[PDB]
């Protein structure tokens, strides 16, 4: 007669006494129990095929992905505590800088720079949301999926600030076209086509290993360095102290994403040939990333530099992983 | 050996019951009763167990054997009480 265990049976016998994180995020996916028939239905359904091919057949291999652990050990309970605080800080900025008339102090030039370079980001950001949410549903382990979950929420969050600030800006400069003109800018402005291609294409890289690399290793670093880093510093020097602080607030999220993206790569390197697998994918997308940074940053004042810093800063993200 | 689905009379659930291709209907019902009589259904002495094909209702003779009934493996049979 099986006597009661000290913890879950799949964690039984390590003996640093599991953590809430481990207790609630490990070995949860079940479609990975039968690689031949992942779902409890006919093995030929399109969804069976899609998983057999994009999760199981991925060249990025590891004997046991469930071993993965989020370095920040995020859990739904602690994600909301972390972010509820961060939102308090941010909604704070919005509320008070407004009370101060911050938007009225911006020059006509800068207001136009915002309609061009800032606000249309609601698209690129939502695109990332979509991107990180695809990783969530095709990754081979609940702990990898979870990192993807919170990161997707973070994206919707960046999208929400932008949406918010767009209306605030529109109320202050009703003739600029804020909120009404972004789709055309996202779709026709040369400065944006670089990023739009990178993301539209990356969005159809279905292999989980490649989706992860395409989105978290190449695209995001480049989006983060171009839109948060570069535009932020510009904003700061242009008197837009809000966007400068806002962009910084979001960079915090970007960093948590990099943190777990690294942990994953560190793990993937524990096995032969993956570094090569990861580098062929990066080699494939890096070119589209440089094209995005060149189209965007070159249109910003002090262009060539923004292009040089974003280029090496985002490269540095991967270099530090190997 | 041949599997069939037993849907005993007055019982509540059809069950898996392995019979033999050589068994007469009488013996098939014997094997089915074992899983229903004195478990969920009261015995009925002054009665006789007959076997009918559940799908169409064909009633097999007590003496007929499995080989001659043209059954599909796993075929569902009603085991009813008759005179």
């Amino acid at each position: 007669a099986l006597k009661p265990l000290k913890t879950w049976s799949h964690l039984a016998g390590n003996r640093r006494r599991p953590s809430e994180y481990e207790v609630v995020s490990t070995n949860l996916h079940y479609f990975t129990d039968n690689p031949e028939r992942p779902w409890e239905l006919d093995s030929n359904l399109p969804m069976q095929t899609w998983y057999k091919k994009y999760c199981f057949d991925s060249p990025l291999k590891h004997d046991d992905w469930n071993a993965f652990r989020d370095p920040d050990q995020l859990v739904y309970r602690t994600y909301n505590l972390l972010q509820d605080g961060q939102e308090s800080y941010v909604q704070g900025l919005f509320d008070q800088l407004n009370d101060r008339g911050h938007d009225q102090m911006l020059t006509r030039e800068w207001v136009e720079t915002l309609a061009r370079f800032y606000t249309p980001a609601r698209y690129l950001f939502h695109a990332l949301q979509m991107g990180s949410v695809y990783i969530h549903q095709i990754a081979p382990a609940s702990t990898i999926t979870n990192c993807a979950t919170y990161e997707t929420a973070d994206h919707l969050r960046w999208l929400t600030h932008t949406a918010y600030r767009t209306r605030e800006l529109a109320n202050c400069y009703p003739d600029v076209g804020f909120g009404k003109r972004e789709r055309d800018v996202w779709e026709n402005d040369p400065a944006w086509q670089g990023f739009r291609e990178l993301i539209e294409k990356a969005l159809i890289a279905w292999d989980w290993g490649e989706a992860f690399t395409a989105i978290n290793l190449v695209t995001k670093p480049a989006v983060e360095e171009a839109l948060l880093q570069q535009l932020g510093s510009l904003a700061q020097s242009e008197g837009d102290t809000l966007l400068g602080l806002l962009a910084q607030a979001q960079k915090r999220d970007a960093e948590r994403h990099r943190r777990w993206s690294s942990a994953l790569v560190k793990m993937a390197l524990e096995k032969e040939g993956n570094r090569e697998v990861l580098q062929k994918w990066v080699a494939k997308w890096e070119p589209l990333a440089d094209k995005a940074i060149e189209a965007y940053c070159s249109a910003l004042p002090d262009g060539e530099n923004a292009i040089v810093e974003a280029k090496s800063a985002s490269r540095y993200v991967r270099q530090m992983m190997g | 050996t041949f599997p069939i689905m037993s849907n005993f009379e007055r019982d509540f659930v059809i069950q898996l019951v392995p019979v033999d291709t050589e068994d007469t209907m009488d013996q098939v019902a014997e094997k089915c009763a074992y899983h229903s009589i004195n478990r969920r259904v009261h015995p009925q002495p002054e009665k006789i167990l007959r076997v009918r094909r559940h799908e169409d209702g064909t009633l097999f003779p007590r003496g007929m054997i499995v080989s001659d009934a043209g059954l599909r493996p796993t075929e569902t049979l009603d085991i009813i009480f008759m005179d």
Binding site: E40, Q48, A163, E197 | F12, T74
Partner: protein, 491 residues
């Protein structure tokens, strides 16, 4: 100052664009989107009734967990679980094993819509939907975790869905069919409209009440808390059915609702039915599973469908009829096959309960009551072995549940067999078979447990082997919840 949500909400879901570096179909694969020939513009009419934004979310949900986790800590040392009615402990052990991981799995279902839905409103709501199920998966693992030291059965809160125990298979059969293997539009109808808005929502309300009534506040808090989140994401299906009906596909929509409701009902008649009418103490039941279904579930489906411009499913009258039979059978089945589940089935057929049953179900004692009579004598007369089985029941191929119905004086147990491509299939009802026939490629080569037994896939090929095949061992194999206490009343 701050803006009024009214003022900027729309911008948060003005995120569609005309792709050009890839084609629309490439970006939104039909097998994943299910846009069904309807355009982006058309899908952009999608307007979720219940709106929420990120800040409001992290804030509100932060408070929800504070409360739940606070309560749990406060009542932890009270060890209520140790002195709670065994039927209740069973109820919980059943709940967590069949729901915790499927809750977590729903997170992916929501992810499906978040990425593949063409209606931008649907994509964001699904992102919060994604978050919600994440909470449900975690919190509903965290809570039972407090009892792993009490009985291995609590380990199944995590283990269950990872096994081939017949109930787990029936669960995966349902969830994989409804939310894991469907296109985005489909998921929103079959999962959020049909299943969540249709069943689990009202159910959780009662389960939270039931818990309260059992003196289990930790669980009452847990459930009703989870329940408050259901609203925000269960909506998603409605706007989808609307767009489908307002455009060509009213039939396609109808068909999914039809399947989604039946399959839901079946799972519901073995996981909820048996609990209300038999595990809950007689003194703690304010209505029969049938009364519950009629008042809280059926009425609402009709209003819902009527407002969407759809029709009641073709099987509706059978459905209402079956409210008098099905769960009794599922309960008798589960109890009789006691050792095959991971919790202790509550017989629930003592003199008083039997009166109640007869009152809530006129004719119960003449039909269902009889099997139980025989089970009781054998128990009274010291023949327990005749109350456990020596063979497997016939599993339906659609719902993967035993095929059972009315016994006794009005014996009416049927099997809707179907020969398809050289293989004979067994179905527990007209509708279950029809689910197979309107889409055979979806279920064709799947094999239920009997199928595997009969194929030699279970070895040794006997009951001991089947138990091992289902990961059951003494300690978690179920037996009579009240330990046959109800017997000594017949002597």
């Amino acid at each position: 100052s701050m803006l009024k949500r009214e003022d900027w909400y729309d911008l948060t879901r003005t995120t569609n664009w005309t792709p050009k570096y890839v084609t629309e179909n490439e970006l939104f694969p039909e097998e994943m989107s299910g846009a069904r020939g309807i355009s982006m513009e058309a899908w952009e009419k999608y307007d979720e009734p219940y709106k929420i934004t990120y800040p409001e979310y992290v804030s509100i949900q932060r408070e929800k967990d504070s409360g739940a986790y606070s309560i749990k800590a406060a009542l932890e040392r009270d060890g209520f679980v140790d002195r709670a009615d065994p039927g209740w402990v069973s109820t919980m052990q059943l709940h967590f094993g069949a729901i915790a991981l499927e809750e977590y799995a729903a997170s992916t279902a929501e992810a499906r819509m978040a990425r593949f839905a063409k209606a931008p409103g649907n994509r964001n709501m699904a992102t919060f939907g994604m978050m919600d199920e994440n909470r449900h998966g975690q919190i509903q693992l965290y809570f039972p975790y407090a009892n792993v030291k009490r009985s291995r059965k609590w380990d199944w809160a995590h283990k269950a869905i990872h096994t081939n125990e017949w109930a787990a298979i029936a669960a995966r059969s349902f969830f994989d069919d409804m939310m894991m293997t469907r296109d985005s539009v489909a998921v929103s109808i079959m999962l959020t409209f049909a299943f969540e808005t249709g069943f689990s929502n009202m159910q959780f309300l009662g389960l939270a009440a039931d818990a309260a009534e059992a003196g289990d506040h930790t669980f009452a808090s847990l459930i009703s808390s989870i329940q408050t989140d259901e609203s925000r994401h269960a909506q998603q299906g409605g706007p989808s059915l609307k767009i489908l009906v307002e455009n060509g596909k009213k039939d396609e929509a109808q068909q999914m609702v039809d399947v989604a409701i039946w399959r839901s009902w079946k799972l519901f008649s073995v996981l909820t039915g048996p609990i209300m009418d038999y595990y809950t103490p007689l003194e703690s039941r304010n209505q029969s599973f049938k009364e519950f279904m009629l008042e809280w579930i059926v009425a609402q489906f009709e209003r819902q469908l009527l407002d969407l411009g759809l029709d009641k499913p073709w099987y509706w009258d059978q459905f209402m009829q079956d409210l008098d039979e099905t769960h009794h059978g599922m309960h008798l089945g589960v109890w009789y096959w006691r050792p095959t589940v991971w919790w202790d089935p509550a017989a629930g057929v003592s003199p008083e309960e039997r009166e109640w049953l007869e009152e809530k179900y006129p004719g119960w004692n003449d039909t269902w009551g009889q099997c139980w009579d025989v089970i009781t004598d054998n128990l009274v007369n010291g023949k327990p072995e005749l109350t456990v089985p020596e063979t497997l029941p016939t599993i339906c191929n659609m719902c993967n549940l035993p095929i059972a119905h009315t016994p006794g004086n009005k014996w009416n147990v049927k099997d809707y067999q179907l020969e398809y491509e050289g293989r004979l299939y067994h179905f527990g009802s007209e509708a279950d078979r029809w689910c197979f026939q309107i889409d055979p490629e979806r279920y064709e080569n799947h094999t239920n447990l009997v199928d595997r037994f009969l194929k030699g896939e279970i070895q040794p090929a006997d009951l001991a082997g089947a138990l091992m095949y289902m990961s059951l061992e003494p300690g978690v194999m179920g037996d009579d919840a009240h330990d046959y206490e109800w017997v000594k009343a017949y002597q």
